[PDB]
Amino acid sequence: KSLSMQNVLIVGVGFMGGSFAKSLRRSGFKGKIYGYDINPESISKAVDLGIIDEGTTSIAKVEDFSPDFVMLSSPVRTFREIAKKLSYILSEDATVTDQGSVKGKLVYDLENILGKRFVGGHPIAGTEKSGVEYSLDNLYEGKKVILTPTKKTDKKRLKLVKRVWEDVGGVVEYMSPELHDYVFGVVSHLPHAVAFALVDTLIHMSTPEVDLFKYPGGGFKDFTRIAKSDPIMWRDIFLENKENVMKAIEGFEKSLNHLKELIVREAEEELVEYLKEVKIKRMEID
Amino acid sequence: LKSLSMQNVLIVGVGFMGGSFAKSLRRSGFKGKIYGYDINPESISKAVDLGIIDEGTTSIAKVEDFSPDFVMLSSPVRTFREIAKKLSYILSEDATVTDQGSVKGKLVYDLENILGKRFVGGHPIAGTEKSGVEYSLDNLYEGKKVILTPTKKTDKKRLKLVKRVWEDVGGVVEYMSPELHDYVFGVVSHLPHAVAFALVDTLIHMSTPEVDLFKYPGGGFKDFTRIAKSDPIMWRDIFLENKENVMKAIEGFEKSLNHLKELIVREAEEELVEYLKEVKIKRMEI
Numbered sequence: 001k002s003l004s005m006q007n008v009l010i011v012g013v014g015f016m017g018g019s020f021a022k023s024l025r026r027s028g029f030k031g032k033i034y035g036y037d038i039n040p041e042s043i044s045k046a047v048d049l050g051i052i053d054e055g056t057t058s059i060a061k062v063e064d065f066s067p068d069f070v071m072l073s074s075p076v077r078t079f080r081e082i083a084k085k086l087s088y089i090l091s092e093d094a095t096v097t098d099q100g101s102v103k104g105k106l107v108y109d110l111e112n113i114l115g116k117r118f119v120g121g122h123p124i125a126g127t128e129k130s131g132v133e134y135s136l137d138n139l140y141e142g143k144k145v146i147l148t149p150t151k152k153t154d155k156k157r158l159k160l161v162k163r164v165w166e167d168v169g170g171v172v173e174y175m176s177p178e179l180h181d182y183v184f185g186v187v188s189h190l191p192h193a194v195a196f197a198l199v200d201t202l203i204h205m206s207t208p209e210v211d212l213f214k215y216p217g218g219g220f221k222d223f224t225r226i227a228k229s230d231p232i233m234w235r236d237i238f239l240e241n242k243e244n245v246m247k248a249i250e251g252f253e254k255s256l257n258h259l260k261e262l263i264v265r266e267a268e269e270e271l272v273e274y275l276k277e278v279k280i281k282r283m284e285i286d
Numbered sequence: 287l288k289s290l291s292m293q294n295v296l297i298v299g300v301g302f303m304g305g306s307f308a309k310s311l312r313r314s315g316f317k318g319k320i321y322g323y324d325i326n327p328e329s330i331s332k333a334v335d336l337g338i339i340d341e342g343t344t345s346i347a348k349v350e351d352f353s354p355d356f357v358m359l360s361s362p363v364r365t366f367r368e369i370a371k372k373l374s375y376i377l378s379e380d381a382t383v384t385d386q387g388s389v390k391g392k393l394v395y396d397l398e399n400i401l402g403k404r405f406v407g408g409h410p411i412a413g414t415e416k417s418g419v420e421y422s423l424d425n426l427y428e429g430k431k432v433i434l435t436p437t438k439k440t441d442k443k444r445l446k447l448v449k450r451v452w453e454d455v456g457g458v459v460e461y462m463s464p465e466l467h468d469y470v471f472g473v474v475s476h477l478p479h480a481v482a483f484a485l486v487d488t489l490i491h492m493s494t495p496e497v498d499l500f501k502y503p504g505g506g507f508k509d510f511t512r513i514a515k516s517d518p519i520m521w522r523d524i525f526l527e528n529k530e531n532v533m534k535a536i537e538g539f540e541k542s543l544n545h546l547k548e549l550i551v552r553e554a555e556e557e558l559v560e561y562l563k564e565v566k567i568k569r570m571e572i
């Protein structure tokens with residue numbers, strides 16, 4: 001009947017932060033939406049789009065905003081040092097949460113830094129776009145949002161963050177931080193990794209007279225979609241989820257090694273079978 | 287008048303590509319007969335029902351009553367040889383045979399050995415992961431590359447014919463030796479298929495009694511693996527027929543993947559970024 005999120009801080013006002021801010025307003029949130037960014041232009045473009053009401057590039061200026069709900073949306077490796085400043089600035093009743101692509105250890109360090117204020121999350125929604133000029137107001141509609149509560153999580157804040165994601169249309173599901181990094185190490189980080197390595201392959205396998213990038217129409221096209229992926233976002237994911245990424249890369253090698261042994265032996269029905277399972281499983285999801 | 291040059295067309299393999307060929311031929315104003323040959327009698331009746339072929343047969347002998355002067359081989363690649371042996375005597379000396387097979391190389395020379403002057407090797411760089419005459423399109427080749435692989439033995443009159451025919455359906459024709467062809471598409475087509483298939487195979491064997499990874503397709507897995515729904519027989523044929531190149535391509539890819547793994551393990555922040563930045567190469571886009 002009447003609610004309690006006064007002032008919302010968007011930390012890192014780019015594509016995800018702006019999609020959050022826009023989505024939230026479009027769901028009928030009527031309080032303040034503020035921005036903190038190291039880039040004055042991220043805040044400038046954002047204000048000019050009516051995406052935020054006001055922002056800054058001083059973290060100290062954030063206290064004048066009195067945020068009670070903070071969404072972290074910069075690259076994941078900026079989170080810890082930002083949480084530290086925030087822990088001196090934020091009211092004990094503020095809630096802090098995030099859209100970072102990695103969870104695991106990060107969620108525990110952030111609980112430790114921010115005490116009971118922290119709830120880890122990750123919307124599985126993305127279109128590989130960069131910058132706030134690209135942000136959408138319906139990005140989260142029908143998408144899984146994963147929250148990663150731990151024994152220490154404040155239940156009410158868990159509930160508050162969950163409601164909020166539902167208001168922008170997300171479908172919420174809980175996972176342990178560790179399980180999240182495994183699941184997404186395999187389902188998301190590993191595919192990006194092989195996409196980057198494929199692009200690298202075609203660079204090294206071109207000759208001066210033969211440009212392999214002239215011939216995308218035979219299966220490579222979907223892979224070029226990594227053209228748009230942000231190199232700093234991915235460097236940060238790869239390092240922060242290092243262990244699980246190595247594991248996922250190893251399982252893949254395992255799969256690729258099998259397939260190629262089938263090719264070497266010049267199998268036939270084994271190979272056909274292998275391809276047949278893969279088709280069947282990949283069709284199940286679409 | 288002009289097309290006394292092509293009167294009776296045989297499509298061998300009345301599937302997605304064979305039917306897309308028949309459909310584009312008709313659409314471009316071909317008035318002659320289009321016949322079909324397939325070991326699957328359902329391919330034939332479906333093609334006739336859909337107005338894609340006028341008549342067809344599952345009996346190779348029958349093909350002689352059709353009197354074909356232009357044959358487009360559209361079955362899985364490893365059927366071409368045995369089929370060719372049947373055609374070498376069923377077909378007129380004045381007939382032309384060409385193909386849409388995804389591999390060239392040795393198979394081109396073999397087919398000019400069986401078929402003589404009749405044969406011209408070809409490969410339209412068009413299509414999708416779908417199988418079956420039901421998914422045939424009438425505009426599949428428009429503005430797509432088509433690679434013809436003439437040799438020192440190719441009849442020049444038949445080359446011009448096939449080339450013209452690909453142009454009448456919207457194709458953009460260029461030439462490659464049969465060996466360069468198999469190198470190029472080994473790397474830009476066959477390798478991305480192997481990699482997509484192995485990507486799916488990875489989620490199968492990294493799933494667990496604690497988690498079905500197929501439940502989370504939205505972080506990159508889906509987009510990158512459409513082509514893993516491709517047809518198992520077609521791909522088996524491709525991997526075996528072009529094995530020396532597929533193996534070289536896969537090894538080259540492992541060299542790239544290993545490089546990235548290396549940058550990740552030693553947390554080489556700057557190099558990683560620069561490796562990922564490779565995707566911003568102009569060569570690539572759209």
Ligand SMILES: NC(=O)c1ccc[n+]([C@@H]2O[C@H](COP(=O)([O-])OP(=O)(O)OC[C@H]3O[C@@H](n4cnc5c(N)ncnc54)[C@H](O)[C@@H]3O)[C@@H](O)[C@H]2O)c1
Binds near residue numbers: 039099
């Ligand atoms: N597909 C996706 O784009 C997607 C999906 C899920 C999660 N995420 C997560 O969203 C977060 C942000 O991603 P994005 O795609 O919006 O990126 P983006 O490149 O648009 O924006 C990042 C924004 O954060 C700002 N920023 C960078 N360093 C900062 C710092 N030290 N302090 C304050 N601000 C800083 C940048 O100026 C930019 O405005 C990441 O944690 C990422 O893992 C992205």
Ligand SMILES: NC(=O)c1ccc[n+]([C@@H]2O[C@H](COP(=O)([O-])OP(=O)(O)OC[C@H]3O[C@@H](n4cnc5c(N)ncnc54)[C@H](O)[C@@H]3O)[C@@H](O)[C@H]2O)c1
Binds near residue numbers: 329360361386413
């Ligand atoms: N996008 C693509 O799917 C694509 C693109 C370019 C080239 N190709 C090539 O085109 C050919 C056909 O591919 P498709 O995707 O149309 O496969 P498809 O499965 O749709 O159709 C192949 C057809 O050949 C028939 N067939 C199988 N063995 C046969 C035999 N021994 N004799 C006669 N018919 C036989 C099948 O019954 C089927 O009707 C393949 O050589 C493939 O490499 C495919």
Ligand SMILES: O=C(O)CCc1ccc(O)cc1
Binds near residue numbers: 411412
């Ligand atoms: O599905 C795709 O995008 C690849 C289509 C495609 C597959 C094989 C081939 O030889 C040419 C084209």
Ligand SMILES: [Cl-]
Binds near residue numbers: 214215217431
């Ligand atoms: Cl192409």
